[PDB]
Amino acid sequence: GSSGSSGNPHMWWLQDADPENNSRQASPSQESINQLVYMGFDTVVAEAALRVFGGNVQLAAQTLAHHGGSLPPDLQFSGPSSG
Task: Please return the burial class of 33, using the count of CB atoms within 10 Å of its CB with bins 0-12, 13-18 and 19+.
Answer: buried
Q: How was this structure determined?
A: NMR
Q: Is the dihedral of CA 13, 17, 20, 25 positive or negative?
A: positive
Asked if 44 and 4 count as a contact pair (C-beta separation under 8 A), the reply is yes
60's CB contacts (< 8 A; 6+ apart) are 36, 41, 46, 49, 50, 52, 53
Torsion, CA 23, CA 24, CA 29, CA 35, rounded to 10: 50
